[PDB]
Symmetry: D2
Subunit: 337 residues, 4 copies
């Protein structure tokens, strides 16, 4: 069978195909309490019916002030467990595996009141200046990722992904453009990586399953991080037990980015080869032919699909047809697929 | 703009477009009690997110022995109201109108114990011979359609459709091939239509909203019903206040049917023109071009889509693209659609 | 199989499928002598390689002053025979049948010098007033259609189509909006039809093969011709031996026309049913599903494709795929189709 | 504009886009004289009307016994000039540039009589054993490529490509699996490359325009040539003035090849980077998205399309639509494109 529909096993978790629903914020928690709503249930479960191998739930805040907006999903309270337990059970029942992206928006948080970051530097001219986290606060945040991971495990998730990309809190600590700290969390690449290092180690104390980390492989800015920097971080993550690196890019600050089909694939290929780390490719991949080429030419291990899954929830079927192959259909739709 | 995406008003109900999700059994009520399950919620709500103007819920039995299978949805108990109330609230919240198809499988019921029909004539060689309904039993069944309609209203449905097609109970009374009764419910076309006439009148005593009736416009069999007979029934339904006739065909008995794109459209066009009744076209309609042609040439008023919505839940978007036009996307998917 | 790809026989001509390349002017006779050029050869022959059942060559003038533009093809001289003979030989060699549309632009001719029409009435504000043809001039023109038909036969064409549509000379005589004559060629519907009647009879004196006539089934204007008038003309054409009526519409004068997929199909269906005449459907038909629906529901006998064949010369292949069926490919492309 | 539709200049020749019609044998010279036929004219010219930037004419034999079949095109006689001159003139008139692939089938020639190769080793068990070319014959063949190039120049071609791939004569000399010669044309990579070296140098004495060379970048066989070998040959070709290397693979002998979308792209990327040579990518590239990715990620300079151009002669238009961009349409089809 096509590589796109060939299984892969990661830490006891076996995915039936290589299609992954990339995490995408829905801004639909209208009660502003970070809880799930019927919309979220239908939104996610429908792609499970659609045969996506792994569905990654949108950025879920580990602290209420770490939300991007007050409509974001959260996982900062035990009260969030009940809802997530229902979602994981139903997604798995339809045949898919499910993961959750643990997040903290840092200086890009669009909330009232003080927002936090490694240094008091605003995202742009239209944003509020964040408050520099005290060492105590940085360590409490590490514990919040750990506590959130514990809740995710209890809720039944198969995979946990750490959001270290798109200019949010962890990415802010990683890049010299946003981190000007003078303590143990700033300076050398070792110190800039320390926040992520501690998060990974603490999460490992409560979670032994598949662990993914999403990164922005380049800042596309002078004096910022580039692929060489991320190959270095990737080697350190490998040593810590990270199973796969989800390769995105940009958004730390505004930058000129040449966007085209497969524009972020070179990052996934370089990290995979140089860091001997499994990688996820993402970025304007909209058909089965490109997905297959990426996998077959050894550029990545999983194909993350975002916007095409918003246009076509049953992308798996469409891709199978494009590749002239067959895949199992959800039982209820056998007479249509 | 395109007619397919132009609003239409029926009674006090306005549909935002003319695309309808044709009723389709999901055989997913696993507890065998006719109640809804999480799968049903995701299945239906996802097409509401997908912008379908009107979603018609699958055949729902008005009596437990009227189910096609023990895994069918039901509406014979007040215990069914709670679940349906949640479903209608969520589908409408996503922007669509919702209907329910009231049904009774008659001699095609696949259940243990006696099954019923107008006459003791089996569907085929592999089916049990049904019990001829006594006149009182027929009247009790009319009351059950009435009681089911009352529950549908309480649950919040916008439209009610009577299932008088596909060889089920009502169709069985309508056709001389299956109705050999010699009492008030058999013989002349008027008497064969009496059961449906009484159901329509009783339903109208508890429901004043949009009322649709789905028919099989031909039996494709010698001595059976043909389009001329249905044009006649349509005129009577118009007099009774039926708002639209959903035009399907066949299934009373096995028959040779030439299937092709738009194979049932001639039924919708003839009933529309000769009975001055709004009609719904259904049958191998899979793209926006054909849908627009049917509406623009005056062959039907609503376009019912079945299997294409199982392959593409977001058919509305696909059709809009095919017609080189734009439609509103669910707010959450604005950056993908 | 699919009706679209089932053979059909007209007289002594059998078409391998029911797809027809609608006549389309290319304005490529640069020497202004009506002769063919290399571009015409590649343009037409490529659709023969593409498996179109019947290819109809663009409007070819029967008199030099009957051209739409000085870049049009012509068939008014024996000097035109040599070129056409080469074209018919090559198109037929590739497996298709070929026809030619005999024409005269009348008052819509864009040439220097006097132009002719049934009455001295200009097409519009930006057009020259035509000279009213004397009775003798009308008779000379009938002889020119006859002489052109004889040349078409000598050149090897399989079908001859008379252009009686789109506001050109013959259509001008047919409509009371443009024909105000008081002699034998004007007044009653019979007299307005006389010019076409004589052309058909004279052409039949030199041509006994398939004869098509393209009409504009409606003027979409008050006091102008409508489908009822054309059903009448169709009955007369049937009596005269015309084999098929190619159903287009409009262009006699400017008018508001609602265009959409299959907007001219009702004309083909009504003429077919009421005049018992084979018809060709044309007008925004761009896919195999609609083509099959038109044929299966008995709305027309041949499907004429214009613009979609300019976008996709191999539409036959595309349509076959859309209908989930297989057709023979040109031998040279067996490893691609 | 998209890179796929961005120009590129090679030795005074400017291509308007990066789409190239890969050379494809048509086996249509029915007179067995290597001359062009109307089919060839329509076949090639239609893709020029279709806006392909560069059209490469199929393998054309430099010696009659170098044909693959007796139906192949040839360029071994001055009599072939007349026909080619007409083809180049007409393709250029439609807006495209045109090239020709100079070839000699070697041991894969399917002709009666002795066939030639560097060594007496058959292609497979179903093929005739070739005659080992004498040194005199090898040198005469070099002169035939030179003489053929002179004819191509006189005929008006814009580009000349040397066929050194797919197991034909030149490839046979390059690989140790097929070349066991003990003279100056066999042994070391220098001697195995000598035949090609002399062909390039002699062709340069009569042709100063764009020069392409198509190679099979791997034999996919133990002890055969691999990408490392071809990177080496590429460096030598660069020194000799070759402008671009058309990167194909296989066919020297039967081998197990994993075929998938873009399966030969790694060869084009590696040769481009390591030999600093412009390259052409080819192999299961069927859409504009993949074509754009290949160009944008710097994997090749030109995108060669074979089978998709047999299915869709107007691939350029399709690709433009897929990339959401606009390109000029042939004047005659402005109302369709
Ligand atoms: C509406 C929307 C919401 C998104 N939310 C998230 C998110 O919560 N976490 C994340 O890592 N990326 C997020 N992304 C980025 C996507 O996951 C994905 O990486 C990006 O769209 C590139 O892929 P695509 O071209 O397949 O859409 C979002 C994108 C969109 C359009
Ligand atoms: C899985 C499945 C379930 C169906 N269930 C119902 C039903 O409950 N009631 C009904 O009236 N028709 C039912 N139908 C018939 C469809 O509503 C529809 O009329 C038919 O499929 C023709 O349309 P299509 O070609 O768009 O699918 C069902 C069809 C399928 C394939
Ligand atoms: C460029 C062009 C040239 C045409 N030339 C002719 C012609 O010579 N004769 C004719 O009867 N119709 C002519 N037509 C009308 C077409 O044959 C056809 O009936 C019309 O485009 C409707 O079909 P379509 O939607 O498939 O294109 C032409 C149309 C176009 C766009
Ligand atoms: C019918 C046919 C004829 C071909 N003839 C030639 C040829 O003359 N010269 C050549 O170098 N390749 C030839 N090829 C190989 C193609 O040019 C092309 O490299 C191959 O099909 C891979 O690309 P594709 O997937 O885009 O078709 C031919 C392929 C086919 C299917
Ligand atoms: O809402 N969005 O567009 C987002 C949200 C989170 C993220 O990581 C990237 C984009
Ligand atoms: O839409 N859904 O999938 C749902 C909706 C509500 C619910 O309680 C469970 C699942
Ligand atoms: O399950 N099914 O296939 C069905 C069920 C009901 C109906 O009206 C038609 C078909
Ligand atoms: O393009 N073509 O098909 C042609 C061109 C020239 C010719 O003499 C015959 C056919
Ligand atoms: O050039 N054109 O657009 C035309 C030419 C002839 C015709 O019958 C219709 C349209
Ligand atoms: O005919 N064919 O399939 C061919 C011909 C020539 C070539 O280089 C490769 C394939």
């Amino acid at each position: 069978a096509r590589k796109l529909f060939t299984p892969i096993t990661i830490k006891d978790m076996t995915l039936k195909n290589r299609i992954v629903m990339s995490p995408m914020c829905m801004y639909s928690s209208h009660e502003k309490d970070g809880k799930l709503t019927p919309f979220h249930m239908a939104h996610y479960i429908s792609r499970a019916i659609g045969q996506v191998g792994l569905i990654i739930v949108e950025a879920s805040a580990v602290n209420p002030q770490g939300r991007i907006t007050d409509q974001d999903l959260g996982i900062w309270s035990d009260e969030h467990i009940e809802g997530f337990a229902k979602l994981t059970e139903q997604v798995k029942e339809q045949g898919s595996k499910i993961g959750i992206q643990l997040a903290h928006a840092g200086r890009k948080a669009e909330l009232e009141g003080d927002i936090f970051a490694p240094s008091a530097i605003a995202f742009d001219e239209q944003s509020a200046t964040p408050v520099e986290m005290s060492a105590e606060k940085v360590k409490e945040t590490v514990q919040e990722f750990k506590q959130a991971a514990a809740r995710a495990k209890e809720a039944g998730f198969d995979v946990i992904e750490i959001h270290a990309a798109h200019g949010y809190l962890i990415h802010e600590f990683l890049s010299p453009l946003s981190n000007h700290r003078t303590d143990e969390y700033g300076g050398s690449p070792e110190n800039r990586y320390r926040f992520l290092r501690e998060i990974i180690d603490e999460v490992k104390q409560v979670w032994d399953g598949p662990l993914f980390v999403r990164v922005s492989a380049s800042d596309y800015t002078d004096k910022g991080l580039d692929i060489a920097d991320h190959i270095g971080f990737a080697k350190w993550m490998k040593e810590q037990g990270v199973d796969l690196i989800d390769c995105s890019s940009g958004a730390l600050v505004h930058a000129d980015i040449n966007v085209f089909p497969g524009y972020q694939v070179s990052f996934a290929e370089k990290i995979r080869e140089q860091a001997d780390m499994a990688t996820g490719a993402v970025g304007m991949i909209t058909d089965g032919s490109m997905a297959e080429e990426i996998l077959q030419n050894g550029r990545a291990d999983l194909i993350f699909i975002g916007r095409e899954l918003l246009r076509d929830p049953f992308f798996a079927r469409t891709a199978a047809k494009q590749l002239n192959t067959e895949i199992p259909a959800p039982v209820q739709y056998e007479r249509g697929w």
